[PDB]
Amino acid sequence: MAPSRANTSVIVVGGGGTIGSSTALHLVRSGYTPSNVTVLDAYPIPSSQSAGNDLAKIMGVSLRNPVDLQLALEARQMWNEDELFKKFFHNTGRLDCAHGEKDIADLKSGYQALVDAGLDATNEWLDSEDEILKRMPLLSRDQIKGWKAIFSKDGGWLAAAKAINAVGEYLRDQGVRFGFYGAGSFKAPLLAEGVCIGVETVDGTRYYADKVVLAAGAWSPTLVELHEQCVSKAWVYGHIQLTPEEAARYKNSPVVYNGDVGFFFEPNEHGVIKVCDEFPGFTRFKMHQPFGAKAPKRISVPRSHAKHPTDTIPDASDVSIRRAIATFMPQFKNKKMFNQAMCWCTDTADAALLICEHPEWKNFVLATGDSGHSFKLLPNIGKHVVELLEGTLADDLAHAWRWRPGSGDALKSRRSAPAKDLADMPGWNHD
Numbered sequence: 045m046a047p048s049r050a051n052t053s054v055i056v057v058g059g060g061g062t063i064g065s066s067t068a069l070h071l072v073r074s075g076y077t078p079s080n081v082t083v084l085d086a087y088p089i090p091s092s093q094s095a096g097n098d099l100a101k102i103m104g105v106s107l108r109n110p111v112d113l114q115l116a117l118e119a120r121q122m123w124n125e126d127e128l129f130k131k132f133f134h135n136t137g138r139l140d141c142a143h144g145e146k147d148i149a150d151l152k153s154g155y156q157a158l159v160d161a162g163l164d165a166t167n168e169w170l171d172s173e174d175e176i177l178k179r180m181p182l183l184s185r186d187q188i189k190g191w192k193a194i195f196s197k198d199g200g201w202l203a204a205a206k207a208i209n210a211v212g213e214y215l216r217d218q219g220v221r222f223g224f225y226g227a228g229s230f231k232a233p234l235l236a237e238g239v240c241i242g243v244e245t246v247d248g249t250r251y252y253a254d255k256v257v258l259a260a261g262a263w264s265p266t267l268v269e270l271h272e273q274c275v276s277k278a279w280v281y282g283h284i285q286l287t288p289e290e291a292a293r294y295k296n297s298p299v300v301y302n303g304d305v306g307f308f309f310e311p312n313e314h315g316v317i318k319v320c321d322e323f324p325g326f327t328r329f330k331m332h333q334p335f336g337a338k339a340p341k342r343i344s345v346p347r348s349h350a351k352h353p354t355d356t357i358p359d360a361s362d363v364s365i366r367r368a369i370a371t372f373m374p375q376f377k378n379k380k381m382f383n384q385a386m387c388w389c390t391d392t393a394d395a396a397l398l399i400c401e402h403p404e405w406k407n408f409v410l411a412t413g414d415s416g417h418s419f420k421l422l423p424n425i426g427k428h429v430v431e432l433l434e435g436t437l438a439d440d441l442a443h444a445w446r447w448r449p450g451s452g453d454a455l456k457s458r459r460s461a462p463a464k465d466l467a468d469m470p471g472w473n474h475d
């Protein structure tokens with residue numbers, strides 16, 4: 045007879061990443077026996093190639109629809125109040141800025157949506173250079189001519205690697221089982237007459253459990269057949285070094301974001317500032333056969349920086365990140381950029397998550413579709429994956445997250461354009 049919580053075993057594939065580690069965290073917190081939880085990943089938690097594993101990330105701009113609202117609020121509560129996560133959230137505030145008549149109009153209606161969702165207390169509209177420089181004087185009046193902004197008091201950045209590592213340490217201490225590398229890289233579900241009973245990894249190690257969760261990020265559509273519900277894309281970052289004097293000047297600075305430029309935020313403990321641009325992402329299409337598809341298909345397969353650490357970023361991304369520096373930090377415009385790299389995410393057509401049982405395999409549950417904006421949900425997203433496993437997922441979440449092949453083009457998703465492909469963007473490959 046099929047089990048209580050204490051007797052239920054769960055494998056989390058990709059449990060070294062954002063959604064996976066959250067899932068393992070909430071299994072244990074909700075009272076699964078730790079030894080009954082297995083975390084499998086290609087790399088040790090925090091996984092080298094996890095989009096959530098770098099020294100610092102920003103919370104980022106919320107999406108403006110009610111499910112994302114509720115998730116981001118859940119997350120915010122936990123980043124403020126959860127003893128595990130609190131210490132890694134740096135509540136510097138955020139400026140979401142815009143320039144151009146269309147962009148500013150969209151920013152303003154976005155602002156109104158926030159007011160109308162009841163976030164008026166923590167968001168203010170800034171309608172001049174002066175009001176923006178008040179919130180961050182270190183911005184350049186020349187550069188932000190005619191900018192307007194939303195300032196969010198609740199915004200900030202996240203010691204992301206440190207957070208996932210704290211989760212990993214907690215899982216470890218509690219007695220979660222780990223397999224990494226050959227013993228952690230998913231190859232295929234184990235199936236008994238149409239029902240999933242485990243997974244086999246690349247090196248042929250077999251694991252058995254009552255539930256399997258595929259939280260494999262950008263790799264999810266490469267591992268099992270998803271009929272293009274998820275299309276995986278790379279974004280880019282670089283770093284600049286500030287002197288101790290400069291770093292101290294920039295300390296406690298808000299996150300600054302502009303959708304036409306990119307973002308940056310305060311330097312870390314080592315006086316390093318991370319800079320990103322904003323763009324529709326890059327695919328890397330090639331032939332690959334997920335499991336559960338008759339035949340190899342052209343799909344976007346991440347080019348992993350962990351597998352290929354000599355990779356950088358396309359020349360065009362160097363140019364766009366440079367432009368961001370020159371706009372945000374004109375006085376640093378000559379600083380050398382280092383540790384430029386790509387991180388991989390996976391887009392759904394509607395940019396909502398894909399968290400559902402796989403129609404073909406009972407007890408095989410997808411938890412992916414992160415759509416380039418889910419790191420903020422590290423604290424909370426696992427709770428809802430567990431809910432799904434337990435049949436208790438709220439209706440609206442289950443709906444937003446449901447299986448939905450053929451329901452839109454994820455290559456474009458909600459971005460401004462279909463992603464370009466790395467094959468056509470020179471300068472990242474240094475083999």
Ligand SMILES: Cc1cc2nc3c(=O)[nH]c(=O)nc-3n(C[C@H](O)[C@H](O)[C@H](O)COP(=O)(O)OP(=O)(O)OC[C@H]3O[C@@H](n4cnc5c(N)ncnc54)[C@H](O)[C@@H]3O)c2cc1C
Binds near residue numbers: 086094411412
């Ligand atoms: C530059 C950049 C800026 C971003 N900005 C923001 C932001 O401001 N705010 C925000 O909320 N989000 C942001 N995102 C997105 C955020 O990083 C992701 O949405 C989130 O981290 C993805 O979570 P995930 O668990 O789906 O994937 P990941 O964290 O990448 O985890 C997937 C895991 O699966 C593992 N895996 C892969 N293949 C296998 C296999 N065969 N077997 C076992 N395991 C496997 C991987 O090793 C990895 O650990 C940003 C991302 C990038 C790259």
Ligand SMILES: [Cl-]
Binds near residue numbers: 102138199200299
């Ligand atoms: Cl932010």
Ligand SMILES: [Cl-]
Binds near residue numbers: 290293375
């Ligand atoms: Cl300076």
Ligand SMILES: [Cl-]
Binds near residue numbers: 346
């Ligand atoms: Cl490759």
Ligand code: NA
Binds near residue numbers: 094098
């Ligand atoms: Na990293």
Ligand code: NA
Binds near residue numbers: 177181183184185
């Ligand atoms: Na200034």
